[PDB]
Swiss-Prot record:
Superkingdom of origin: Eukaryota
EC number: 2.3.2.23
Name of the featured protein: Ubiquitin-conjugating enzyme E2 G2
Gene name tied to this protein: UBE2G2
Presence of the UniProt keyword Zinc in the record: no
GO molecular function, one term: ubiquitin-protein transferase activity
Length: 169
């Protein structure tokens, strides 16, 4: 079949890489984890500056669909994390990573959802902001949601643990 959409996705991905290379954004680093496969990217998220996740170095994997940029990639942290918006297996669940009207009724579905005008940079950018600002309204991690809403002081405690664990301590 016309692996034309795949080829287009590839070129789109190369373009975004070129751009991240010549115009790197702060606290982010991402790129194919192997030249041979531009659909599997490795990334590093640095913990937001004055947040409970500061000084943390969180690696992640972005897997891009063959129809990119029509659909968003899947993003999964590779280290341990404790966030309301992150699943047990590392999967990141935020609006920009869901197809418009993907599912789960959304008003703001209209603007904060995936679209060809988005980019891995913007994705990574919002994930960073996700770290710096949680939203207990994401059953990704029930325990993290409950804790953040109820006992937040303990949340900050476990978060600092997450950072240390990422540092290899």
């Amino acid at each position: 079949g016309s692996e034309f959409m795949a080829g287009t996705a590839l070129k789109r991905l190369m373009a975004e890489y070129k751009q991240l290379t010549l115009n790197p954004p702060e606290g982010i680093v991402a790129g194919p984890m192997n030249e041979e496969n531009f659909f599997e990217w490795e990334a590093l998220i640095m913990g937001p500056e004055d947040t409970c996740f500061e000084f943390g170095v969180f690696p992640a994997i972005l897997s891009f669909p063959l129809d990119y940029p029509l659909s968003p990639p899947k993003m999964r942290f590779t280290c341990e994390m404790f966030h309301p918006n992150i699943y047990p297996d590392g999967r990141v669940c935020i609006s920009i990573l869901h197809a418009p009207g993907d599912d789960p009724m959304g008003y703001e579905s209209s603007a904060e959802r995936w679209s060809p005008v988005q980019s891995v940079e913007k994705i990574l950018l919002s994930v960073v902001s996700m770290l710096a600002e949680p939203n207990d309204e994401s059953g990704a991690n029930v325990d993290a949601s409950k804790m953040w809403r109820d006992d937040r002081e303990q949340f900050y405690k476990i978060a600092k643990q997450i950072v240390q664990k990422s540092l290899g301590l």
